[PDB]
Paper text:
The mammalian/mechanistic target of rapamycin complex 1 (mTORC1) is a large (~1 MDa) multiprotein complex consisting of two copies of three subunits: the evolutionary conserved Serine/Threonine protein kinase mTOR (a member of the phosphoinositide-3-kinase-related kinases superfamily of protein kinases, PIKKs), RAPTOR and mLST8. mTORC1 senses and integrates inputs originating from nutrients, growth factor signaling pathways, oxidative stress, and cellular energy levels. Two endogenous negative regulators of mTORC1 activity have been identified to date: DEPTOR (DEP-domain containing mTOR-interacting protein), which also inhibits mTORC2, and PRAS40 (proline-rich Akt substrate of 40 kDa). DEPTOR is a 46 kDa protein that consists of three distinct and highly conserved regions (from N- to C-terminus): two tandem DEP domains (a DEPt), an unstructured linker of ~100 residues (residues 228–323, which we have named long-linker) and a C-terminal PDZ domain. Our structural and functional analysis of reconstituted mTORC1 inhibition by DEPTOR revealed a unique bipartite binding mechanism, involving an interaction of the DEPTOR PDZ with the FAT domain of mTOR and the DEPTOR long-linker interaction with the FRB.
A similar reduction in DEPTOR IC50 was observed for the cancer-associated mTOR mutant A1459P. The cancer-associated mutant A1459P is in the middle of a helix fα12 at the major intra-FAT hinge, and our cryo-EM structure of the A1459P mutant bound to DEPTOR (global resolution 4.7 Å) shows this helix becomes disordered (residues 1457–1470). This disorder likely increases plasticity of the intra-FAT hinge, thereby improving DEPTOR binding. The structure of mutant mTORC1 bound to DEPTOR reveals a widening of the cleft between the mTOR N-heat and the PDZ-bound FAT domain, relative to this cleft in the structure of DEPTOR bound to wild-type mTORC1. This cleft widening might enable easier access for DEPTOR PDZ to bind to the FAT domain. Consistent with this proposal, we observe fast on/off kinetics for PDZ binding to the mTORC1 mutant A1459P with a Kd of 0.6 µM determined by SPR. For the wild-type mTORC1, the Kd is increased ten-fold (Kd = 7 µM), and we observe slow on/off kinetics, which suggests that there is a rate-limiting conformational change within wild-type mTOR to facilitate binding of PDZ. Structurally, the interaction of DEPTOR PDZ with the FAT domain does not seem to be significantly altered between mutant and wild-type mTORC1. Despite tight binding of DEPTOR PDZ to the A1459P mutant, there is no inhibition of the mutant by the isolated PDZ domain (without the long linker), even at saturating concentrations. This underlines the need for a bipartite interaction for effective mTORC1 inhibition by DEPTOR.
Numbering used by the authors:
A (entry chain B): 1867 to 2436, 2492 to 2549
B (entry chain E): 8 to 324
C (entry chain B): 1261 to 1458, 1474 to 1530
């Protein structure tokens, strides 16, 4: 170890003025300092358990403004423990500096900190909660108490135990018995019997529960017996109550909030600022009251529409959902703070108003949280349907022209797939979108402005999408603002190149550009306004790599994001570094070929051609609307 | 059926294999592929038998029996089998198919498994005849002209125009010239050059052919080797003098009106008589029989339920 | 029945701005009084008492009578209306009828005909000369749908500058190199473009040379060309020639 240690401590002599000039620059500036904030916290989490690294860090930690750490509350609640001895021990205290000055910011993250499955986090949480309780006038006790109502209602027990039951038949079958009946079905009924048989309206929740119970008896008999009669009894009884549930999940819509939970609705005018919307630079806007009934969106996931009165008279609208922890999304929206700040530095970027539309993300479990309900927005998918349906054009004509030319489409050769795709495309107009945007808009003078803002906001996320690797761009995963014409984006489940990896219909695309969008842009096509907006953004990125690469490297290497990445893709640190290596190919023009440095114009031209291959397009799945 | 000295063999996208006594103007028998899209059809030049190939499958049948079922079957290349031929004596089948593993298969005895394998990084996009029957011409999704010895992997892997999958190739019947075809719309012709050492062929460049706007599909010689045809997604078959591989005459279905462009993406050509006739896989509902050099349309056959995928032919022993 | 259309058919003898504005208002009053809607038939009283809100009700009143015209009554009224624009460019009624046409374009009546061809060019010209550059741009986009010409591009490009969009004008030139090929007409127009950008040979360069300020070569050019030429060509270049002399400190030459 001595060779790498001597190197690491001669490196630490370099780290000393690195850290010092970082801290004094972090004193001298705001915003951009976050690159430095990340890097010092990084080298600390990397190597801080040596006392000689602790020397460089601790004096600067103890001689820099609190506001520094308000930049990293989520990035620092991520690994709230950071378990290595003097590292975690000092970070516990450092988080209780925010847990002295600014509890209204920290308290949602401290709610998150409560309910780790593994021990480590839960312990740092209980320490830091009760360190903060006195420093914060027992605000913690009010806020955790309130949040505990919301956490329980959040994936309201009924839809969960229904879905677990429907899943359980699709688990026990064949010979893998435990996965369905044993594991789901008794814990399910136990978690009706405590939970919604008490902290929801007992009897009517028990309206399903009382037939789920008689199937549960036969299930409990089978669990221990192994008598194959108990199995078929348990299943047939479950099929009967499942069939009752099967008719009612389709037609619940709006739900009285105390019947959603009798403690919910009833809290008022709190010691809490509105859910992570607020910040301590402003006078408080406080949770005052709640919408009387919360509303299941008519979708496969069944999220709840909500709104909260703030003490300032505003209403703040949220969508309550969960099948993954929103932190991953939060960190994607956090990076957009930086990219917006880059475009705000350059005079021509600034003059042309360029930015990404970030939106509010508030995680509350491994599954769930609140998402900000954006106003004024419709999916790109819905609008095409509206236009076609209102005109009484046959909705999905293009797939039908393909099948009528050849029903064999999906197993044709390369060039035959292309030929039939070209034929169905050439037999169909490709500009419904251009028409509906004009029709919808009031008058030409507004419409021209809208077309411009549409074009530019599309161009911006053409570049950041391509840098990130982002895919799954079917038009039900795109959204449009009906006042400005700005585009908006709504899923990031697979950010990196792995969209190209998907085995059946690989998303063989750098970013989505397509005939209805291009035909909705100017009659000139993309050269001029679009192409030049692409150049300016890529120049600004080609330049400020130290900022963007720091945020990327920090996020992408992260030992806890590595479990999100084992859910996304795939130590993984190597694949993470390979992604950063490929980003550094995109830096130069080595992305097209590993030998080459290319100018921005040449890089963009090759990128456009990659985004217009007929072959790639008719290797998206037909449900991706590659005809549009 | 099989006794006729001139037989037309075909499929539509409907993939049913349609066999015409060529003089007749009727599909005299039909073999009902409705499992998998046809990817090649391969009647023996001896007029006796056919290997019929499609997605995941090849099967072996006679020409003289009415609507036959598989006498031998071939399976496991669970991909598009874009080209099929033989060890020319009829001992083995050869297949270019879009698994990473092209194959030699038994026609000496009943076997479903391949007699041998050729393995490549990128899956296999085309094949052609090679006269020694100690190598095979192979082409693929790496764009590499894998002329390949049948056991050693002594191989050519040449790429004349950069990177792209080579869509087809063919040899001179007298094996002095070889033409290689690409998705970029082009063909490149290289002089066949010989080595007894190792077990592998050599190529030297001859002619550069930017033949079409649209993607170049297939080429074939007249039986006298005097002409080489080349044909495309572009709706026309251009005929070259073998001497310098430049234009004699052209037979075209380039549409009378652009209201119906792709009257057909003609999927290549074959010949009949002593270079009297040229035939095309015309990608219209017609399989199309024409005269060479005169360039003129003689008989056309509409029996396919969907438009033509492939043309296979006999006017030979 | 037809008194409505007769009050537009006075278009044979409306001459002054007030004649056509009086025609528009008294027409509106007859459209209201014989409208398909009982509501509007009362609103006719207010419209008489107070014209500014009649400007509004007119658009509805128009649909309310225009649905009750068959092809003859349509053609009859169409002519009196296309004659309102055709007679004169009068900005008031021009902008008003442009909004009325645009209102029809959003309507499911379709666009009104005006001298065939959905009025596209008449509307375009009228809009352009009314400084309403976005509406003019919309009609020029619409002509480009009915097939391109070099004259369309050399119209369109000025509209993009009249609306302050340099990158859009750059797009049209880029289009004109790839759609139209190296079309030798536009390939000449690289020296008809306002920027230097790599007597039309003499002054149709000196404009560019004194914009750039290639002061040495510009001084030689101005000295040479001014001493050579003898017409309004001397007068039109004398800016660049005094400017060159100034740039060179030649106070004697400058006069």
């Amino acid at each position: 170890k001595k060779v790498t240690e001597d190197l690491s401590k001669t490196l630490l002599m370099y780290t000393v003025p690195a850290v010092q000039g970082f801290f004094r620059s972090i004193s001298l500036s705001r915003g951009n300092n976050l690159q430095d904030t990340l890097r010092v916290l990084t080298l600390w989490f990397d190597y801080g358990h040596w006392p000689d690294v602790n020397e460089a860090l601790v004096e600067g930690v103890k001689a820099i403004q609190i506001d520094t750490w308000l930049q990293v509350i989520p990035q620092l609640i991520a690994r709230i423990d950071t378990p290595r001895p003097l590292v975690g021990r000092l970070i516990h205290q450092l988080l209780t500096d925010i847990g002295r000055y600014h509890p209204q910011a920290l308290i949602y993250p401290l709610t998150v900190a409560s309910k780790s499955t593994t021990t480590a986090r839960h312990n740092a949480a209980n320490k830091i909660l009760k360190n903060m309780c006195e420093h914060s006038n027992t605000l913690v006790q009010q806020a955790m108490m309130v949040s505990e109502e919301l956490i329980r209602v959040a994936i309201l027990w009924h839809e969960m135990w229904h879905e677990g039951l429907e899943e359980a038949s699709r688990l026990y079958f064949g010979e893998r018995n435990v996965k369905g009946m044993f594991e789901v079905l008794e814990p399910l009924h136990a978690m009706m019997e405590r939970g919604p048989q008490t902290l929801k309206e007992t009897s009517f929740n028990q309206a399903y529960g009382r037939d789920l119970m008689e199937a549960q008896e036969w299930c409990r008999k089978y669990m221990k017996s192994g008598n194959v009669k108990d199995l078929t009894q348990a299943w047939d009884l479950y099929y009967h109550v499942f069939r009752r549930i099967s008719k009612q999940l389709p037609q619940l819509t709006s739900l009285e909030l105390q019947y959603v939970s009798p403690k919910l609705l009833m809290c008022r005018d709190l010691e809490l600022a509105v859910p992570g919307t607020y910040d301590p630079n402003q006078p408080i806007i406080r949770i005052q009251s709640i919408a009387p009934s919360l509303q299941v969106i008519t979708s496969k996931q069944r999220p709840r529409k909500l709104t909260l009165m703030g003490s300032n008279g505003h209403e703040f609208v949220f969508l309550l959902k969960g099948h993954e922890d929103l932190r991953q999304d939060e960190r994607v929206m956090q990076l957009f703070g930086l990219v917006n700040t880059l475009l705000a530095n350059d005079p021509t970027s600034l003059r042309k108003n360029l930015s990404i539309q970030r939106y509010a993300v508030i995680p509350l479990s491994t599954n769930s949280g609140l998402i900000g309900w954006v106003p004024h927005c419709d999916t790109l998918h819905a609008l095409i349907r509206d236009y076609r349906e209102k005109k009484k054009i046959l909705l999905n004509i293009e797939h039908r022209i393909m099948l009528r030319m050849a029903p064999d489409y999906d197993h044709l050769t390369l060039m035959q797939k292309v030929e039939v795709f070209e034929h169905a495309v050439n037999n169909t107009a490709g500009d419904d979108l251009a028409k509906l945007l004009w029709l919808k808009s009031p008058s030409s003078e507004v419409w021209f402005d809208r077309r411009t803002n549409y074009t530019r906001s599309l161009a911006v996320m053409s570049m950041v999408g391509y840098i990130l690797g982002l895919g799954d761009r079917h038009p039900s995963n795109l959204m449009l603002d009906r006042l400005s014409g700005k585009i908006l984006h709504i899923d990031f489940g697979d950010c990196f190149e792995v969209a190209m990896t998907r085995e059946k219909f690989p998303e063989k695309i750098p970013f989505r550009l397509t005939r209805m969008l291009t035909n909705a842009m100017e009659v000139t096509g993309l050269d001029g306004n679009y192409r030049i907006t692409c150049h300016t953004v890529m120049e600004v990125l080609r330049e400020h790599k130290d900022s963007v690469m720091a945020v990327l490297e920090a996020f992408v290497y992260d030992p806890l994001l590595n479990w999100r990445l084992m859910d996304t893709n795939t130590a993984l640190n190597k694949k993470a570094i390979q992604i950063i290596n490929r980003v550094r190919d995109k830096l130069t023009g080595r992305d097209f070929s590993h030998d080459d440095t290319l100018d921005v114009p040449t890089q963009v031209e090759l990128l456009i051609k990659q985004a217009t291959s007929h072959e790639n397009l008719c290797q998206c799945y037909i449900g991706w609307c590659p005809f549009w | 059926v099989g006794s006729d000295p001139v037989i037309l063999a075909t499929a539509g996208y409907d993939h049913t294999v349609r066999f015409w006594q060529a003089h007749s103007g009727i599909c005299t028998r039909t073999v009902q592929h409705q499992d998998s899209q046809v990817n090649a059809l391969e009647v023996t030049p001896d007029r006796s038998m056919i290997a019929a190939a499609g997605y995941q499958h090849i099967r072996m049948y006679d020409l003289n029996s009415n609507n036959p079922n598989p006498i031998i079957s071939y399976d496991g290349v669970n991909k598009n089998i874009a080209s099929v031929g033989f060890h020319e004596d009829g001992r083995w089948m050869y297949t270019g198919g879009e698994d990473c593993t092209a194959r030699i298969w038994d026609l000496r005895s009943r076997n479903l498994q391949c007699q041998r394998i050729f393995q490549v990084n990128a899956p296999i996009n085309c094949v052609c005849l090679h006269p020694n029957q100690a190598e095979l011409i192979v082409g693929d999704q790496s764009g590499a002209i894998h002329i390949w010895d049948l056991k050693t992997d002594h191989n050519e892997q040449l790429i004349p125009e950069p990177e792209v999958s080579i869509t087809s190739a063919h040899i001179d019947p007298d094996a002095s010239y070889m033409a290689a075809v690409n998705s970029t719309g082009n063909c490149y012709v290289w002089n066949l050059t010989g080595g007894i050492g190792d077990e592998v062929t050599q190529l030297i460049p001859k002619t550069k052919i930017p033949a079409h706007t649209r993607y170049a599909l297939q080429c074939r010689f007249s039986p006298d080797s005097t002409l080489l045809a080349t044909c495309s997604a572009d709706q026309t078959c251009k005929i070259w003098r073998t001497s310098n591989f430049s234009l004699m005459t052209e037979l075209s279905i380039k549409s009378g009106n652009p209201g119906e462009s792709s009257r057909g993406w003609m999927w290549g050509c074959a010949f009949s008589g002593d270079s009297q006739y040229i035939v095309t896989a015309s990608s219209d509902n017609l399989a199309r029989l024409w005269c060479v050099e005169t360039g003129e349309i003689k008989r056309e056959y509409g029996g396919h339920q969907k438009a033509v995928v492939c043309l296979a032919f006999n006017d030979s022993v | 029945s037809t008194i409505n259309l007769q009050k537009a058919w006075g278009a044979a003898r409306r001459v002054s701005k007030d004649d056509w504005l009086e025609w528009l208002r008294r027409l509106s009053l007859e459209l209201l009084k014989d409208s398909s809607s009982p509501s509007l038939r009362s609103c006719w009283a207010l419209a008489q008492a107070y014209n500014p809100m009649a400007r509004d009700l007119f658009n509805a009143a128009f649909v309310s009578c225009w649905s009750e015209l068959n092809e003859d009554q349509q053609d009859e009224l169409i002519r009196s209306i296309e004659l309102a624009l055709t007679s004169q460019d009068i900005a008031e009624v021009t902008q008003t009828l442009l909004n009325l046409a645009e209102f029809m374009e959003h309507s499911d009546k379709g666009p009104l005909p005006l001298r065939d061809d959905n009025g596209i060019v008449l509307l375009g010209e009228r809009a352009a000369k009314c400084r309403a550059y976005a509406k003019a741009l919309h009609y020029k986009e619409l002509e480009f749908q009915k097939g391109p010409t070099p004259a369309i591009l050399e119209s369109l490009i000025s509209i993009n500058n009249k609306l302050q969009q340099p990158e859009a004008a750059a797009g049209v030139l880029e289009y004109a190199m790839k759609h139209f090929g190296e079309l030798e007409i536009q390939a000449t127009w690289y020296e008809k473009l306002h920027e230097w950008e790599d007597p039309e040979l003499m002054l149709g360069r000196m404009r560019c040379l004194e914009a750039l300020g290639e002061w040495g070569q510009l001084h030689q050019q101005c000295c040479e060309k001014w001493t050579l030429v003898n017409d309004e060509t001397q007068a039109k270049m004398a800016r660049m020639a005094a400017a060159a002399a100034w740039g060179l400190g030649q106070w004697d030459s400058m006069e």
